Amino acid sequence: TCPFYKKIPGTGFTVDAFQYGVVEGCTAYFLTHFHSDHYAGLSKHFTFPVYCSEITGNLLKNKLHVQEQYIHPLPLDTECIVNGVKVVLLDANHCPGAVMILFYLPNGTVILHTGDFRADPSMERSLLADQKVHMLYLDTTYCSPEYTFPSQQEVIRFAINTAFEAVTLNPHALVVCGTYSIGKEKVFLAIADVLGSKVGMSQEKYKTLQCLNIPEINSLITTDMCSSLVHLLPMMQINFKGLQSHLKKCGGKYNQILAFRPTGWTHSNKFTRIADVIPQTKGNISIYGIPYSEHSSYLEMKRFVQWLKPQKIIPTVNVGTWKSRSTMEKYFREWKLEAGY
Numbered sequence: 379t380c381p382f383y384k385k386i387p388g389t390g391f392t393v394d395a396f397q398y399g400v401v402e403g404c405t406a407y408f409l410t411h412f413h414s415d416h417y418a419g420l421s422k423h424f425t426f427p428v429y430c431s432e433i434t435g436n437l438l439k440n441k442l443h444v445q446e447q448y449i450h451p452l453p454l455d456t457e458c459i460v461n462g463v464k465v466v467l468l469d470a471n472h473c474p475g476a477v478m479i480l481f482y483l484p485n486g487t488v489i490l491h492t493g494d495f496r497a498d499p500s501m502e503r504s505l506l507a508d509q510k511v512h513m514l515y516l517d518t519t520y521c522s523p524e525y526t527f528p529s530q531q532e533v534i535r536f537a538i539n540t541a542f543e544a545v546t547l548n549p550h551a552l553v554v555c556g557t558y559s560i561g562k563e564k565v566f567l568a569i570a571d572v573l574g575s576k577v578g579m580s581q582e583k584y585k586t587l588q589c590l591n592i593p594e595i596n597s598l599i600t601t602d603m604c605s606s607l608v609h610l611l612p613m614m615q616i617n618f619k620g621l622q623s624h625l626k627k628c629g630g631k632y633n634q635i636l637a638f639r640p641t642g643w644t645h646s647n648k649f650t651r652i653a654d655v656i657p658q659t660k661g662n663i664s665i666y667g668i669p670y671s672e673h674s675s676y677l678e679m680k681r682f683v684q685w686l687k688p689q690k691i692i693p694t695v696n697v698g699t700w701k702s703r704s705t706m707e708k709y710f711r712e713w714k715l716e717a718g719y
């Protein structure tokens with residue numbers, strides 16, 4: 379059964395609620411982004427209206443074979459009417475096609491659902507600036523002060539500089555980047571651009587990337603692995619065994635692997651600066667864990683909420699334990715008392 383925090387009161391609407399069968403009284407199903415925990419249950423046999431971004435709708439059609447007649451893509455930053463209710467989709471600064479949804483209820487209540495997001499000060503000048511929000515359904519993934527990480531820009535600088543140094547020292551080194559879902563494409567695209575290579579990958583991943591409206595993409599990616607010195611592989615294969623095996627497959631073109639695993643947070647964030655990050659090495663294979671996050675840090679989250687000043691917060695992440703729930707409620711109260719709303 380669908381949990382309360384996926385239901386929008388006063389509407390016939392649910393958000394990211396595809397794994398519960400037919401939800402009683404739901405006339406339109408919203409999908410914030412194409413990540414498996416959120417789309418779980420969608421397929422070609424789904425026959426209710428799905429509302430989402432253009433990019434999410436490309437993935438629905440091509441990857442999950444959802445029929446076109448049930449996909450309703452909406453433009454961003456545009457007031458739209460759905461089953462008699464005004465809605466707006468906003469960029470969520472998560473993975474490609476990820477949105478936040480503003481709902482303007484018939485009784486005058488305004489609700490913001492963040493989906494998954496990385497809060498940014500740029501959001502303070504979207505259509506959010508123009509009215510009050512009563513209820514906030516918040517991505518609380520990293521809602522504790524131990525969760526610090528660098529900007530995305532500093533992380534990409536580290537990766538570009540690392541890869542360029544390595545391959546300039548040894549022109550026979552291969553760079554490998556791990557992936558298991560959409561998001562974080564900047565990691566591998568930035569490295570390929572500094573090395574003047576295309577990124578090589580499986581046909582299934584190439585298909586996924588061709589759905590994302592990334593400009594000049596035919597220029598940056600390929601399925602011809604032999605022509606590329608940046609290869610993408612499944613995240614599970616980013617280990618010394620899986621990388622030794624891959625190196626064998628390249629037929630003596632290469633004699634070294636430098637590999638990147640973009641994680642969210644790891645506890646080496648509490649001690650080490652990005653400048654100071656070092657790899658795990660075995661023989662001619664080095665593996666770097668880099669803290670590239672597409673969720674809010676604690677401080678980014680706090681600033682957004684203290685700016686927005688909602689009357690009520692509903693967490694959508696870490697809601698399964700009493701200890702988590704109590705911790706989050708304590709922070710929301712601190713934030714409110716410090717800011718004075």
Ligand code: NI
Nearest residue numbers: 411413472494
């Ligand atoms: Ni996500």
